[PDB]
């Protein structure tokens, strides 16, 4: 019972969905759907601003009644160019992503059972550990690592 890739795809879809021009007074930037669940390398990326959603480890905890609190880490990285400056643009992107991550409801993803039915679900909660900017990188190319632990619960098993 694991939903790493489903949660990551839901996160990517949520980010791409809630950044268009429909809400200019809520969000600063507009990625035009330039959000992907994997990046081969920094040198391969061709468009900016660009955000990659990495997959971290998977901690698990068990509860007396068969429940299972099982956690997942979501390190999110963004890239931008020196159109004006690294600091202001990266701050705008990070604050925008934080506003996306903190408002709204939960994470809605699609869980596909082996039978052939995909039931939409909802993750429990989201908490930010820390946000960090990678100084010392290339002069026109920046980075802003924002760490996230998505806490969710699988279908009831371990009976």
């Amino acid at each position: 019972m694991d939903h790493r890739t489903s949660i990551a795809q839901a996160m990517v879809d949520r980010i791409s969905k809630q950044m268009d021009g429909s809400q200019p007074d809520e969000y600063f930037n507009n990625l035009y759907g330039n959000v992907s669940r994997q990046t081969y390398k920094f040198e391969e990326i061709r468009e900016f601003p660009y955000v990659a959603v990495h997959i971290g480890t998977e901690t698990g905890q068990y509860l007396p009644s068969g429940q299972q609190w099982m956690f997942l880490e979501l390190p999110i990285l963004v890239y931008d160019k020196e159109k004006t400056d690294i600091q202001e643009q990266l701050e705008k992107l990070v604050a925008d992503i934080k506003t996306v991550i903190d408002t709204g409801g939960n994470l809605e993803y699609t869980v596909s059972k082996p039978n052939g039915s995909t039931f939409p679900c909802e993750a429990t909660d989201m908490i930010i550990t820390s946000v960090s900017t990678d100084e010392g990188l290339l002069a026109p190319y920046g980075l802003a690592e924002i760490n996230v632990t998505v806490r969710y619960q699988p279908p009831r098993r371990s009976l």
Binding site: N106, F119, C121, E122, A123, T124, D125, I127, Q153, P155, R156
Partner: peptide, 18 residues
């Protein structure tokens, strides 16, 4: 006991104290 359907229906209705 509760079935998997109800567990799936209530897995998303938690209340956060944040």
């Amino acid at each position: 006991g509760i079935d998997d359907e109800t567990y799936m229906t209530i897995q998303g209705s938690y209340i956060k104290n944040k």
